[PDB]
Amino acid sequence: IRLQEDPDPEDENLYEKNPDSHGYDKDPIVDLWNMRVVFFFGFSIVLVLGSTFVAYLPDYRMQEWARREAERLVKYREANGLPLMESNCFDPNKIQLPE
Amino acid sequence: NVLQIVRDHWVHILVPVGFVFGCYLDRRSDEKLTAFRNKSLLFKRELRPNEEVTWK
Amino acid sequence: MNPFASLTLTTLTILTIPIMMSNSNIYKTNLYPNYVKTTVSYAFTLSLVPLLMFMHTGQEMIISNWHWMTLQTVELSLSFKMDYFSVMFIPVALFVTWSIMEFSMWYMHSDPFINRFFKYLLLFLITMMILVTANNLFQLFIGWEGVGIMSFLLIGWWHGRTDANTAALQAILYNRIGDIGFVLSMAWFLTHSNAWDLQQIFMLNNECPNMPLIGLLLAAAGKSAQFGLHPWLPSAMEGPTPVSALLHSSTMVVAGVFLLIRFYPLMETNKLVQTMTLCLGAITTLFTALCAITQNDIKKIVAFSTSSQLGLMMVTIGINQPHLAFLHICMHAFFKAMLFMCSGSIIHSLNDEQDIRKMGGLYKAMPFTTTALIIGSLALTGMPYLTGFYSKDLIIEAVNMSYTNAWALLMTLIATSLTAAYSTRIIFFAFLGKPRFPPLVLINENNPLLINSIKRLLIGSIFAGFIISNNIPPMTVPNTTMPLYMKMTALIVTIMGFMLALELNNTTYYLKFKYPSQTYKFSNMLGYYPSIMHRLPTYHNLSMSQKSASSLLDLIWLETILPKTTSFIQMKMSIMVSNQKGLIKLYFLSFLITIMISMTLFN
Amino acid sequence: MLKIIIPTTMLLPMTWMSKHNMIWINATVHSLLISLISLSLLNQLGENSLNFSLTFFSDSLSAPLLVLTTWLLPLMLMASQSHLSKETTTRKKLYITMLILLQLFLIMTFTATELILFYILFEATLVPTLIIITRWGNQTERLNAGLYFLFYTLAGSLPLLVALVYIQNTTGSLNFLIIHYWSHPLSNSWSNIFMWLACIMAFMVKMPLYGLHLWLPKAHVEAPIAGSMVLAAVLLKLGGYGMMRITTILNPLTNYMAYPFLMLSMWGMIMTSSICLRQTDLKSLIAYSSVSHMALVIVAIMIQTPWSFMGATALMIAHGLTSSMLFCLANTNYERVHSRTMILARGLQTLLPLMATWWLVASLTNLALPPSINLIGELFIITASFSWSNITIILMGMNMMITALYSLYMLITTQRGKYTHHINNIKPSFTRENALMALHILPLLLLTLNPKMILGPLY
Amino acid sequence: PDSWDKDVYPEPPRRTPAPAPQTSLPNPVTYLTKIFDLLVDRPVTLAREFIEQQHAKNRYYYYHREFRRVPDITECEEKDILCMFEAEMQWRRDYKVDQEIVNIIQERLKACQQREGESYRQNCAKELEQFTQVSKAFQDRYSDLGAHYSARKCLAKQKQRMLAERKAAKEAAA
Numbered sequence A: 001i002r003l004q005e006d007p008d009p010e011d012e013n014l015y016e017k018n019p020d021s022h023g024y025d026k027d028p029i030v031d032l033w034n035m036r037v038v039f040f041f042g043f044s045i046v047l048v049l050g051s052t053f054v055a056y057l058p059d060y061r062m063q064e065w066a067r068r069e070a071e072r073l074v075k076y077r078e079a080n081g082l083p084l085m086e087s088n089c090f091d092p093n094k095i096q097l098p099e
Numbered sequence B: 001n002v003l004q005i006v007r008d009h010w011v012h013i014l015v016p017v018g019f020v021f022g023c024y025l026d027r028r029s030d031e032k033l034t035a036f037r038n039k040s041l042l043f044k045r046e047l048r049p050n051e052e053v054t055w056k
Numbered sequence C: 001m002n003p004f005a006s007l008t009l010t011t012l013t014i015l016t017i018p019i020m021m022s023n024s025n026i027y028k029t030n031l032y033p034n035y036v037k038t039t040v041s042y043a044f045t046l047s048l049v050p051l052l053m054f055m056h057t058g059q060e061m062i063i064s065n066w067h068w069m070t071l072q073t074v075e076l077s078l079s080f081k082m083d084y085f086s087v088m089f090i091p092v093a094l095f096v097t098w099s100i101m102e103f104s105m106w107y108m109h110s111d112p113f114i115n116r117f118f119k120y121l122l123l124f125l126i127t128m129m130i131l132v133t134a135n136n137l138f139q140l141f142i143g144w145e146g147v148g149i150m151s152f153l154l155i156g157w158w159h160g161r162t163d164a165n166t167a168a169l170q171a172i173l174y175n176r177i178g179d180i181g182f183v184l185s186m187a188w189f190l191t192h193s194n195a196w197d198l199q200q201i202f203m204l205n206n207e208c209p210n211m212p213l214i215g216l217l218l219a220a221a222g223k224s225a226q227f228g229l230h231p232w233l234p235s236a237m238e239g240p241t242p243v244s245a246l247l248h249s250s251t252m253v254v255a256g257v258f259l260l261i262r263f264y265p266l267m268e269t270n271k272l273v274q275t276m277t278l279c280l281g282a283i284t285t286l287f288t289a290l291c292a293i294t295q296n297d298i299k300k301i302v303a304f305s306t307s308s309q310l311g312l313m314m315v316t317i318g319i320n321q322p323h324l325a326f327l328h329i330c331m332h333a334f335f336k337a338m339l340f341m342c343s344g345s346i347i348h349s350l351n352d353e354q355d356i357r358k359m360g361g362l363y364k365a366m367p368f369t370t371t372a373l374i375i376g377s378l379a380l381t382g383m384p385y386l387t388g389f390y391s392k393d394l395i396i397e398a399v400n401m402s403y404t405n406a407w408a409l410l411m412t413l414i415a416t417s418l419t420a421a422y423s424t425r426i427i428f429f430a431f432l433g434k435p436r437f438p439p440l441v442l443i444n445e446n447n448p449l450l451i452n453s454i455k456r457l458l459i460g461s462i463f464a465g466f467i468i469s470n471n472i473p474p475m476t477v478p479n480t481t482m483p484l485y486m487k488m489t490a491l492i493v494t495i496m497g498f499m500l501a502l503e504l505n506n507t508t509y510y511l512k513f514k515y516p517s518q519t520y521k522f523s524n525m526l527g528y529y530p531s532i533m534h535r536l537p538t539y540h541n542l543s544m545s546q547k548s549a550s551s552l553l554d555l556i557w558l559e560t561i562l563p564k565t566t567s568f569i570q571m572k573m574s575i576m577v578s579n580q581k582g583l584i585k586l587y588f589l590s591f592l593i594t595i596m597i598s599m600t601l602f603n
Numbered sequence D: 001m002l003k004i005i006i007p008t009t010m011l012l013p014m015t016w017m018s019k020h021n022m023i024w025i026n027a028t029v030h031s032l033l034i035s036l037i038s039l040s041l042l043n044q045l046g047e048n049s050l051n052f053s054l055t056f057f058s059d060s061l062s063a064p065l066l067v068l069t070t071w072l073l074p075l076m077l078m079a080s081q082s083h084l085s086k087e088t089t090t091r092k093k094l095y096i097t098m099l100i101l102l103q104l105f106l107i108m109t110f111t112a113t114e115l116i117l118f119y120i121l122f123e124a125t126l127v128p129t130l131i132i133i134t135r136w137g138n139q140t141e142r143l144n145a146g147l148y149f150l151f152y153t154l155a156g157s158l159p160l161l162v163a164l165v166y167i168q169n170t171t172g173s174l175n176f177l178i179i180h181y182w183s184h185p186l187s188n189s190w191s192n193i194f195m196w197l198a199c200i201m202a203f204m205v206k207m208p209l210y211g212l213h214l215w216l217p218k219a220h221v222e223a224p225i226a227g228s229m230v231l232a233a234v235l236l237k238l239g240g241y242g243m244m245r246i247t248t249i250l251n252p253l254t255n256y257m258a259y260p261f262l263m264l265s266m267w268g269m270i271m272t273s274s275i276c277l278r279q280t281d282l283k284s285l286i287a288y289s290s291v292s293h294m295a296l297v298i299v300a301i302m303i304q305t306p307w308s309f310m311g312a313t314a315l316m317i318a319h320g321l322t323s324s325m326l327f328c329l330a331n332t333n334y335e336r337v338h339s340r341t342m343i344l345a346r347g348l349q350t351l352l353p354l355m356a357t358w359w360l361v362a363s364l365t366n367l368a369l370p371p372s373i374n375l376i377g378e379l380f381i382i383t384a385s386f387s388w389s390n391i392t393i394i395l396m397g398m399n400m401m402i403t404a405l406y407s408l409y410m411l412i413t414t415q416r417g418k419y420t421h422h423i424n425n426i427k428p429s430f431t432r433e434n435a436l437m438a439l440h441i442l443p444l445l446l447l448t449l450n451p452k453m454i455l456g457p458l459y
Numbered sequence E: 001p002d003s004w005d006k007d008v009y010p011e012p013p014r015r016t017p018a019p020a021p022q023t024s025l026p027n028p029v030t031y032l033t034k035i036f037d038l039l040v041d042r043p044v045t046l047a048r049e050f051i052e053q054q055h056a057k058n059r060y061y062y063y064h065r066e067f068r069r070v071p072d073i074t075e076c077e078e079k080d081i082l083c084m085f086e087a088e089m090q091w092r093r094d095y096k097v098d099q100e101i102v103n104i105i106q107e108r109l110k111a112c113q114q115r116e117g118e119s120y121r122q123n124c125a126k127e128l129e130q131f132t133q134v135s136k137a138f139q140d141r142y143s144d145l146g147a148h149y150s151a152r153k154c155l156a157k158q159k160q161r162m163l164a165e166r167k168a169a170k171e172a173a174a
């Protein structure tokens, strides 16, 4: 040997001391409460509440607003014989081309 | 007893009070950008009889 | 409201219900298989009702119930297309699955995970229903990949069997090449039509081009095991017999044919793709029948028969007869499922023996499975008034009377003869003659489950063709006038195959020995295709994956160019800079040189 | 954004003041609460971004990345408490402190409104990562891995700093809004070519780009489980986010300068999939899968179409979740047998059923299986590349086939077959490990249910 | 139904032929429809009646947001950040509205094809022409702007198109 080194320790098994071990901590009470808080908060709170919150987030992307606006424009334009899609985005009168 | 509980579980309010302080600081940052309030061409409107500002 | 949509969606939902109950005490008990079978029976009847509604007034619908997402100008929604194809294929698949589930209740009694087996069968059924009723390409792809992975999971049922694992992975590989074709077609359709739904695709593609149609053809070939991509279907016989009976032969290998049927307007518009389809189907049916006529594993024989029937369906599509292809799909489902069930009963009664060389005497040993297998073989070869007559005879008549490829026509006729030949081979080596099995006779087929399932699939193999053909509306112009010898071509070639194969099988009784021929070796060894194509390309790819990519490039040259060369240069420069003897004479002479240079060169 | 920044800076003193046995419980609970709070950022506008102040802003590209980071922190805490049982209290607290600092830097990185503040934060993320790797790694190669990671990233990023200060001197501002509104075309000259190269090369090294990727296998294999989780899930997404941000000012030069990078990305995607086919180490297999997926994202960003950007964002989120799950599963196996070789342990399906289920689900998501967000992103990228050119479909199809091959090969090797006879220390799966896998997998399926939340601003 | 606008979403009048049976055999479809009405339709109608009664007691309303017009990027001066911001937001809203217009036209096309069934090639030519025109205009407006599209880029594209049209007109007149 070239050093005074400790022997490599044996693997420590949580099931030996605690048959009903959740694998969080050595202390049974701390391990049980760690499991309870992780499961409760993560699954219940985050998963369920965040999923339903995201599902019922208000339509701030204006998807339904845009659909209603398009319905109104289509109705007005096809009632008056105008093209449904305008040919130009801007006004050529307000655009001044170089000579 | 109860004293040992607070002695050990006084740290669980740190994150909630940090969240409250963060909300307060967000409001403070918002209140300094009130330069175009009720002045944008798109959202300019007359004030209601019993309101001072359009938004806070 | 019209019950049509309600009843169709209800059948789909009640199919999905028993999966929800897989986290319950009923799933922990032994009542789950019977529960699932009862659910499938109820779904079958509830799907029979809309079939009656359609066959009266020809009612068809599309249901865009849920809107998924809008990619700017493209809207993707959960839409189901309940048309003739869907309302005619759902009851048939449910009937076959009901019979297979009862047979699997009898057959998988000793399996510790029979509940998981039934859950997996139901999941495959759900994915197949999604595929069939899909109205848009994305939902169709969902069903496509779902049946692919369920096939992967059910083929490798015995996880400890390396052959099962190889079969599962091989099936995945071929279906992924098919998915390459599918994704090509999806991308082209979206790019050039701004749509992923059949309505707008058909509206905008008045002349569908070669690129999308060839993508679809490649996907169909991969999923339906055409030539080039065929070996995975015979190799899929590693799974339990219920898996082979339900999944592969009956309802899943018809996925590619169904995909090509659903695009029959575009296929009609194009012609080169039709020619390619016809040629591929012809070579597939011929090659698979030729391999079949000389196999000794009964499951392998039935798998090759399934491949040959799929090739015949692809031939039917290529001659521009999409509806005959669907009719043959239904008839083949019936009698091929019954044939697989009969072979499974034979295998189970003979203690997991799958060799016709060790079967024998079963004509009298097992009466009911014998009569069922004889009826199924008669239906397969086109007995003049059974279930397979109302599709195969029309297909042959259409092939002979159309402007087709001469070689494709010849291969189709030869394939019909070889179909008769291998059905005779199965009957002769399995039921006729003296026993060849071990003396301990455990032959027993008196289980009510087995008898009832085979009975239900046996009625369809006799009468279902007549009812189905007489109730559907006329969707094609009949070939009323044709020469007598062309009218009788199918029967003549079938009888010639019967006679020639029977004589060649009778010559096996003589006390004469002769070594195998080159043609025999080519036929028995699957045309040498699995050997070469599974040893050469895989070896080269796996060799370049390590010799070239990992070793030559990653571990050697990409290390040498950037990080190693720079580090070596910096180390050398550091040694040069720091290797000083600490002599004031030397570095003061250096100071003098620096002073001279700064004076002269800097002005 | 302070309502999310300050709770992390309060996670710091809470972790350092909590009792010796309550550190994991407190850190996990409050990290989950912070993730719940950060879920509120997904409510974005259709017109512009969420401009909180002069310093932090949120967009449809930043919001999912922030949610992913905040959700990823507690999972790293669970894995760490798995493998750090015998550590001293001070070193446990230092480990949690490094994780918290990394999360804070990532949050401010994704929410920064200036390119220079973004640079400072995204370079500050290196220090906690390097300390974690080179301090709590298991094997000898952790030191070399840290050196490779650090010097690759810095050699990439220093020319980016020079280019950013040059651009500020030239235009007057590095604010993203200003440079988007006051953008001007980039003329085809050598100076513009080299500015383009500086910025793009920084983020390409961060991606990584094929040929610039060796640090990724080195670092991901040799880092502890938390380091591997954060490196693949989030730290690879800084390059994609930066490229999606800076390419505003690099047009029209991107049309001409993207050819070498597109060719490198496509061919290297094929090459890294093939490498995955013949890997003797599980962690290396996962790392090269990460390289392949990020090469696909690079292709999407370079072709730069509205359909490609949505695919890029969706694929980034999906890959983050999937790679984190795969690393966790491999780490559980390693904790069983204390080795990373793939063929050492087999039959783990007959020894551990539920872990076999988790492996099946993770491997199914690793390949593009519909309707998963992995497939959604990959399909959008493939469609945009098809509109770009019609042989990209050939390359993408080859990549998909090889991806399925190596994913199912890994599953079959590790799970199926017969168990190794002499390995008799494979204890039943822990509730902690099962909960970790569930927390990895369930949000992915929920995202599949609601896909418009991760498709970026171009949706 | 009053849920949607019939003019925006047209439906041809429905012509259902009257039944003309020629056999004394009972109709299984008729019997099953009667069963479906008795067992399903009546209970679901009662449930919906109860739900709608409960809704009518809490009747409240929501409104549709109206944006007044603002000057566009043509009117905005060079590097006038506020006017540029207003014009860019307006252009983005117009882009969304145009996308929804194209979506409506595509829905018309799909529904008409499905409704016509086997005679769709001839009976859906009217909706195919409208879709062709709308898609052509939308493509010319927003065809190749890129991932970082902006009102300035759309204006530059329109200027290029106007210059090309002017040059073509001059060449034709020459």
Ligand SMILES: CCCCCCCCCCCCCCCCCC(=O)OC[C@H](COP(=O)([O-])OCC(O)COP(=O)([O-])OC[C@@H](COC(=O)CCCCCCCCCCCCCCCCC)OC(=O)CCCCCCCCCCCCCCCCC)OC(=O)CCCCCCCCCCCCCCCCC
Pocket: C290, C293, C294, C413, C414, C417, C418, C421, C425, C493, C496, C497, C500, C501, C504, C508, C515, C516, C517, C518, C519, C520, C521, C523
């Ligand atoms: C590059 C070429 C590409 C070709 C592409 C095209 C391919 C076309 C294929 C044609 C069909 C081939 C059939 C045999 C293949 C398999 C051979 C084999 O090993 O079988 C053993 C196998 C028995 O397996 P086993 O029980 O394990 O026993 C092992 C053997 O004992 C082991 O003993 P063995 O090894 O001696 O057994 C084999 C031996 C015995 O088998 C036979 O004799 C089979 C004969 C089949 C019938 C052929 C004549 C048909 C005549 C029809 C007449 C009517 C026409 C219609 C018109 C009527 C009105 C005018 O066969 C031969 O020696 C050759 C047979 C003919 C080969 C044809 C292909 C030629 C390839 C190139 C030339 C090679 C030459 C050298 C050979 C190798 C070196 C020595 O046979 C069977 O199970 C049944 C055999 C076939 C029965 C059906 C026959 C009828 C259907 C096909 C013919 C067409 C009929 C008309 C259709 C409609 C037209 C409109």
Ligand SMILES: CCCCCCCC/C=C/CCCCCCCC(=O)OC[C@H](COP(=O)(O)OCCN)OC(=O)CCCCCCC/C=C/CCCCCCCC
Pocket: C162, C163, C166, C167, C169, C170, C173, C177, C180, C217, C218, C221, C227, C228, C229, C235, C280, C530, C531, C533, C534, C537, C538, C539, C541, C542, D277, D397, D398, D401, D405
């Ligand atoms: C689109 C690009 C792809 C085009 C085709 C490229 C093929 C690349 C081959 C894949 C590389 C192989 C890597 C590892 C694969 C899996 C491992 C493996 O090799 O297992 C071999 C496995 C087991 O061998 P068994 O025969 O079952 O024997 C079992 C004994 N107990 O067999 C296989 O799966 C081999 C599959 C390789 C297929 C190679 C040929 C594929 C054919 C492609 C050409 C056909 C084109 C079709 C034209 C259609 C016309 C529309």
